[PDB]
Ligand binder design. Structure first.
Ligand code: FDE
Ligand code: FDE
Lengths: 455, 115, 452
């Protein structure tokens, strides 16, 4: 019964690393996961990990009493600019639970109602832009979603205006940020991080982190000066942890600000972008959501309440995040010696990787019709098996911004359906850009304005 | 006219505290957007851009060249060959683009172009 | 250590950088080599490099176990629009060995047979253009070689027709490339790249990269509309270690790479040959002789192109004296000593001055400046690593066989069909981008009245 784990082709001292020397590792680890089955060992020079694909094994791994969140090599590299912020801290380090407890109030429903106003502001801007296009013009969707999410998190979280829609070239902050995430990704695969090809990358990497820290330090200045503010940021400053009494040190604040900017803008852009893809490729589904939009959004601008009505829109969004979870994987380590799924013994500290895309393609759980996009799977969510659908991580370390995001996409996705008809004028073949997050690349549409006015 | 004017007010409204306004540029963004909409029902979306429009830059470079020819004591000197080559490159840019304005109509509104 | 290395005149904190404040940097490095000898140190504000000119030292530097291809400051700047292409990639970079193994098939002698036909297509267009000239006119040689070499790489390589011969002011792409290449060279001389005076330059350059990515990235889509060509090998070939084909953006980098390197090296190469032919009329005679004897069909055959032995020798002797890509760079894989005289730290940089190597008197004899193609009658007599016009080792020029075939083919057809006059007594003047071409070179050609 105590069976040895499969391992793909191994090279010399560099182990399995060349297998993942692509610009699309997750898509590659998938095409490897499909080849080796539910679990395989993947060694890199000096590190060892196990990648999981079946719900059967994942149900075992989501026991928080046996496994705790581990920092993947990937996260260890983002920690180079996100430090011990909520995403990249150990759940036992001091600053995790401190910051988790001071900030959690800011994301429950009760707090969401406060954000709803500024969310609509940024969305009206997106719709205003799509209305103001000339006839043969097009929409670059991932780019405009990027404008949207960064403008949305920065305003709700920090009362700071990026004014992305007032720009053609991405906000320079986004250019540096994306290249920093790209660098963390590439450093994973470096067959020799020494030899000179990578010296300018060292230059660029530090130069880009400085870029991010400057505007962060400008957000902190903008507040030391500008107010009745119910913020992520006010809870970060004035907020005190109720157990040891103190507030966050400045350094951890800086890591939290960057953390919040990045995670929201990257996962939420990818989500909406994917959502449009699957909608434009399945038009009756688009039709079905396109009437939920018209039916519920009966005032010129949506109210917080109206967003929770949009049941199918939530269903669409869920089925999209199921197929391509923009945060495709999270990592766990064994709290102590154990046997996983009764077959595989592991010493304490062994690391696990959940390939959320591959879990979400499990036939025993989701059926034989997985890769087809049918939002109707998410209609009795209680019918959905436990630990089968984990796009938002797991346990106490699950995504704190889940509801904020679900609220964000649904509102934005809802208004898009209300005000426009969308044409896949290019017959776009799906191209997934991979930083550490996922999102469609070069995705373009044409949008016919339904000519409904705004407020 | 009001439409373009609200965009300016909204842009200045949406600026952060430490920022300022570059006045000629935003007036230029305004004036061009207003004539393009009132006159020819074409939307430049200057307020959605950071680097100026290809058309506006050609127009600005062409005007500067017209001015620059006033002090040229002999316009045939080879020193001005690149200045000549760009002049025509910008005339094409404007002349091509204007016909883009013409395409939107024959391919219907009380406007300057209709007359 | 034994030997302190020479170094030319230094300008305080600006080091010897002003020494190449010519429009002719390479020629200046030659003038320095001619006086300081087989090796000299050349210092710039942020970098230091050593220039080698004797076959003695070059044989050591071409040891692939001690030295690898380095990106000189020059190639580092081309990396801004040629990115990760073969020419501007590091060996240990992930896309080099990847792209290198998929593309070697497209340039093997076997691949040439397929390129031969489209090679001819563009070659007749050139011949027809010359046949249709009126008598009072002349031929602007570099311009027509640029038209040809670009149309040939674009047609034979990617099945895209630039149609340069149907236009007089050059293609926007080619004008953009040359201006982008000129900017790379222009930077070398800026000890203050942040200074605002370079804003229009930085602007135009950024606009020029957009021009290249525009056409090229459209071509990759325009084919997904498959034949047996270079682009198909890129779209369809698979790497055996990850099993993946080449990146979409990497292909954009290769196409840009191939277009430039071919059109810039081969056009310069042909032009230089023609200069030497009109300046050495007896060599011109014997070359047209073989041309007349071998080129017996209305169209050349692949076999016949190989059967030109003297035309190839003129080509080899041309690239010897003025190698159109004049230099390559190396770095020390580990600490080592060069020529037993000059110790090198790990990472120290070397520059090979191919023109100066190709003038090493101890190797070629004392008539090194004379155009004597018979030096190539016995190519095995030439010492290993004395004649490196295509670089060295695994980083050697991937297209040298494609190039030789094109130059041999075209040069053959020219010799069959025209007689050439140096009607202006043209003095050789070398334009330097990073590559070398002659400037203002003009001839008149009287047709031998022969059909195609
Ligand atoms: C703001 C925001 C937004 C968002 C969104 C999202 C989407 C769309 C998707 C997602 C996801 C996720 N997340 Fe997310 N998100 C966020 C966030 C976050 C944070 C902070 C975190 C960490 C948490 C803790 O616990 O600390 C996360 C988290 C998360 C996760 C897990 C990680 C680990 O490593 O474990 C996942 C998988 N997220 N997400
Ligand atoms: C297509 C084509 C054509 C051509 C031609 C030519 C002529 C006539 C001359 C020449 C050259 C040369 N090349 Fe050349 N060519 C080409 C290409 C190329 C490439 C891709 C390369 C890179 C490869 C490697 O190395 O990786 C080269 C490469 C080359 C070289 C080396 C570079 C360095 O830096 O090392 C040299 C020297 N080429 N070349």
């Amino acid at each position: 019964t105590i069976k040895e784990m499969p391992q793909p082709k191994t090279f010399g001292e560099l182990k399995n690393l060349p297998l993942l020397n692509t610009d699309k590792p997750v898509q590659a680890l998938m095409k490897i996961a499909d080849e080796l089955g539910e679990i395989f060992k993947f060694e890199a020079p000096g590190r060892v990990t196990r990648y999981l694909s079946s719900q059967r094994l994942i149900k075992e791994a989501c026991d928080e009493s046996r496994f705790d969140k581990n920092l993947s090599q990937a996260l260890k590299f983002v920690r180079d600019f996100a430090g011990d912020g909520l995403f990249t801290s150990w759940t036992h380090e001091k600053n995790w639970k401190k910051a988790h407890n001071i900030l959690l109030p800011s994301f429950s429903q009760q707090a969401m109602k406060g954000y709803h106003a500024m969310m609509v502001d940024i969305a009206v801007q997106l719709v205003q832009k799509w209305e103001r296009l000339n006839a043969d013009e097009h929409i670059e969707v991932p780019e405009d979603m990027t404008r949207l999410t960064l403008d949305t998190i920065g305003l709700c979280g920090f009362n700071y205006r990026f004014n992305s829609f007032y720009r053609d070239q991405p906000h320079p902050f986004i250019t540096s940020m994306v290249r920093a995430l790209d660098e963390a990704m590439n450093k994973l695969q470096r067959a020799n991080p020494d030899d000179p090809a990578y010296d300018e990358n060292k230059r660029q990497f530090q130069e880009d982190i400085k870029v991010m820290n400057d505007l962060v330090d400008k957000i902190i200045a903008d507040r030391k000066a500008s107010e009745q503010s119910d913020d992520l940021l006010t809870h970060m400053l004035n907020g005190k942890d109720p157990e040891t009494g103190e507030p966050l040190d400045d350094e951890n604040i800086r890591y939290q600000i960057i953390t919040f900017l990045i995670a929201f803008h990257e996962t939420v852009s990818g989500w909406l972008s994917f959502a449009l893809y699957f909608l434009v490729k399945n038009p009756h589904v688009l039709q079905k959501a396109a009437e939920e939009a018209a039916r519920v959004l009966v005032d010129p601008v949506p109210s917080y309440k109206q967003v929770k009505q949009l049941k199918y829109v939530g269903m669409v969004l869920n089925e999209a995040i199921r197929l391509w979870p923009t945060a495709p994987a999270f990592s766990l380590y064994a709290k102590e010696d154990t046997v996983l799924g009764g077959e595989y013994p592991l010493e304490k500290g062994d690391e696990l990787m959940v390939l959320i895309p591959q879990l979400h393609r499990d036939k025993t759980i989701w059926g034989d019709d997985v890769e087809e996009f049918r939002p109707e799977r998410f209609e009795n969510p209680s019918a959905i098996p436990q630990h089968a659908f984990k796009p938002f991580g797991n346990g106490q370390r699950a995504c704190i911004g889940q509801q904020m995001s679900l609220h964000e996409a649904t509102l934005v996705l809802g208004m898009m359906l209300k005000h426009f008809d969308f044409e896949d004028h290019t017959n776009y073949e799906l191209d997934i850009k991979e930083t550490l997050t996922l999102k469609p690349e070069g995705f373009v549409v044409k949008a016919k304005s339904k000519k409904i006015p705004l407020g």
